[PDB]
Amino acid sequence: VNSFSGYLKLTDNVYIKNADIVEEAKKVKPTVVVNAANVYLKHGGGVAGALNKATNNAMQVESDDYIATNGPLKVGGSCVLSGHNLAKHCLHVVGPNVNKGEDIQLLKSAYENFNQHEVLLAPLLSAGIFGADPIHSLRVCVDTVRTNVYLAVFDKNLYDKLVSSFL
Numbered sequence: 001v002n003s004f005s006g007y008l009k010l011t012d013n014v015y016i017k018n019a020d021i022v023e024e025a026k027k028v029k030p031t032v033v034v035n036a037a038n039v040y041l042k043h044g045g046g047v048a049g050a051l052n053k054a055t056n057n058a059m060q061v062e063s064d065d066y067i068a069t070n071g072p073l074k075v076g077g078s079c080v081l082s083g084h085n086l087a088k089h090c091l092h093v094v095g096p097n098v099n100k101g102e103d104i105q106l107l108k109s110a111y112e113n114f115n116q117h118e119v120l121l122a123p124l125l126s127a128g129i130f131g132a133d134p135i136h137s138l139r140v141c142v143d144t145v146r147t148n149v150y151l152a153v154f155d156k157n158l159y160d161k162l163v164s165s166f167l
């Protein structure tokens with residue numbers, strides 16, 4: 001039993017809700033919140049900008065130190081950093097950005113990072129400003145993630161389309 005509330009169950013392990021991931025994280029305080037990161041961990045907009053703003057820029061400060069030490073992530077890769085006031089940990093995952101020409105096949109590799117964590121609160125990778133089709137992203141999620149994933153979808157209209165079209 002966990003504290004996630006109001007989710008629709010899609011599969012054995014995947015759940016979905018119309019919610020603001022920032023507000024969902026603030027209430028649940030999950031072990032892991034997933035950030036829709038880029039390779040530079042520059043949290044300027046989309047989910048990343050919203051999560052970082054909620055941390056009063058502490059996420060960005062921590063991220064800049066991470067990059068200065070380790071260099072950029074790979075597209076399809078991830079790192080675990082602090083969850084600050086939102087979660088115990090933040091898993092920064094880089095899905096391909098279609099608006100930069102990155103290969104969509106890397107979306108499966110990106111979701112594989114979720115399997116290293118038993119339970120996660122996450123957005124749909126490569127959705128929103130990353131330019132992928134969220135219906136495709138949901139399909140890859142369901143077919144790749146085996147751990148328990150609670151997906152927050154900010155836009156009510158998209159949430160309803162994702163549910164109604166789910167196979």
Ligand SMILES: O=S1(=O)CC(CNc2ncnc3[nH]c4cc(F)ccc4c23)C1
Nearest residue numbers: 021046047050123127128152154155158
């Ligand atoms: O429905 S979409 O097209 C948009 C969604 C991807 N982004 C998000 N996903 C879940 N929670 C979110 N909270 C936010 C707050 C913000 F300021 C900006 C973005 C998000 C966001 C696929």
